[PDB]
Amino acid sequence: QLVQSGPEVRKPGTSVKVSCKAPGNTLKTYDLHWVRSVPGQGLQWMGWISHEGDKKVIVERFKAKVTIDWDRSTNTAYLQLSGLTSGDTAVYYCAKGSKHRLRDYALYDDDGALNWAVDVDYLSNLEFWGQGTAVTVSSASTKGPSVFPLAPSSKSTSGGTAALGCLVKDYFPEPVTVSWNSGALTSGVHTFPAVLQSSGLYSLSSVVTVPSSSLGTQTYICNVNHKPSNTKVDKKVEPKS
């Protein structure tokens, strides 16, 4: 149970500030962590802050352009990406965790007093995670999606079942939500994830398999909504042979 800020879109070279926190004064005794999730590349631990506040460590990869912080008065935590590149387009996770703190070294006075001591922190777990914040880095500008029909035909029919769909092409940025018959058509619907084209614009395909008995009987309209361009699109898919 951790709440983070909404998704972010940045032109290259700029900076993005990401916030995250539990409700109120919940997990003050839990350490702050930041994990990076690149879709299809794995999980990445960036850095951490001790709940005591005597530690703030950042991994060499992110050392140059990343800042972590936490002002204890609002209890709220922050992550800062600067000098953004295209390779910084990833999902950023915050996490609260427990740990072990055991003294590894000690140096004493000649009369017994402790002169110097070093502690070592051992990660126990990351128990509480945030919803996640998506950061997108591109030179592209906001562009409304072109919607084209995937017509059902003789070639797109197997047995007694046919398939049609909408093709959402060349938009920016994500996300695009696709519906069929305003939510009335649910069974057999397959909406694939958007693919990043060579242009820098996304393309998306939403399909649904229907019996050929319905092609004349029923009407199949896809609703394509794209908030960033303030566009909602209704397109009717017909069988044109």
Partner 1 sequence: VLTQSPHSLSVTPGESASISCKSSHSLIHGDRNNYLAWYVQKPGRSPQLLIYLASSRASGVPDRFSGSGSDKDFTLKISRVETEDVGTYYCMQGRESPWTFGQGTKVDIKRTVAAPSVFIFPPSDEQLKSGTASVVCLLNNFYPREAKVQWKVDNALQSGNSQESVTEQDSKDSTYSLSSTLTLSKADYEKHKVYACEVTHQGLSSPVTKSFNRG
- 102 binding partner 1? (CB under 8 A): yes
- 215 binding partner 1? (CB under 8 A): no
Instruction: Closer to partner 1 by CB, 137 or 194: give it.
Output: 194
Taking CB under 8 A as the binding criterion, the range among 13-21, 153-161, 172-180, 224-232 that sits at the site for partner 1 is 153-161
SS (H, E, C) the chain: CEEECCCEEECCCCCEEEEEECCCCCCCCCEEEEEEEECCCEEEEEEEECCCCCCEEECCCCCCCEEEEECCCCCCEEEEECCCCHHHCEEEEEEEEEEEEEEEEEEECCCCCEEEEEEEEEEEEEEEEECCEEEEECCCCCECCEEEEECCCCCCEECCEEEEEEEEEEEECCCCEEEEHHHCCCCCEEECCCEECCCCCEEEEEEEEEECCCCCCCCEEEEEEEHHHCEEEEEEECCCC
- 144 binding partner 1? (CB under 8 A): no
- Distance from C-alpha of 23 to C-alpha of 21, rounded to nearest angstrom: 7
Q: How far is the CB of 104 from partner 1 (least distance, A)?
A: 9
Single residue of 74, 193, 214, 218 touching partner 1 by CB under 8 A: 193
Kindly give, in sequence order, each residue whose CB lies less than 8 Å from that of residue 29, ignoring residues fewer than 6 positions away.
Answer: 51
Single residue of 29, 87, 195, 216 touching partner 1 by CB under 8 A: 195
Q: How far is the CB of 75 from partner 1 (least distance, A)?
A: 20
Instruction: Closer to partner 1 by CB, 95 or 135: give it.
Output: 95
Strand partners, 68: 79
- 118 binding partner 1? (CB under 8 A): no
- 93 binding partner 1? (CB under 8 A): yes
Single residue of 5, 65, 99, 231 touching partner 1 by CB under 8 A: 99
Single residue of 70, 79, 84, 130 touching partner 1 by CB under 8 A: 130
Taking CB under 8 A as the binding criterion, the range among 6-14, 20-28, 94-102, 173-181 that sits at the site for partner 1 is 94-102
Q: How far is the CA of 47 from the CAs of 63, 67, 214, in angstroms?
A: 9, 9, 56
11-50 binders of partner 1 (CB under 8 A): 35, 37, 42-45, 48
List residues near partner 1 by CB under 8 A.
35, 37, 42-45, 48, 57, 59-60, 93, 95, 99-100, 102, 122-127, 129-132, 146, 148-151, 153, 155-156, 158, 161, 163, 165, 167, 169, 190-195, 197, 203, 205, 207, 209
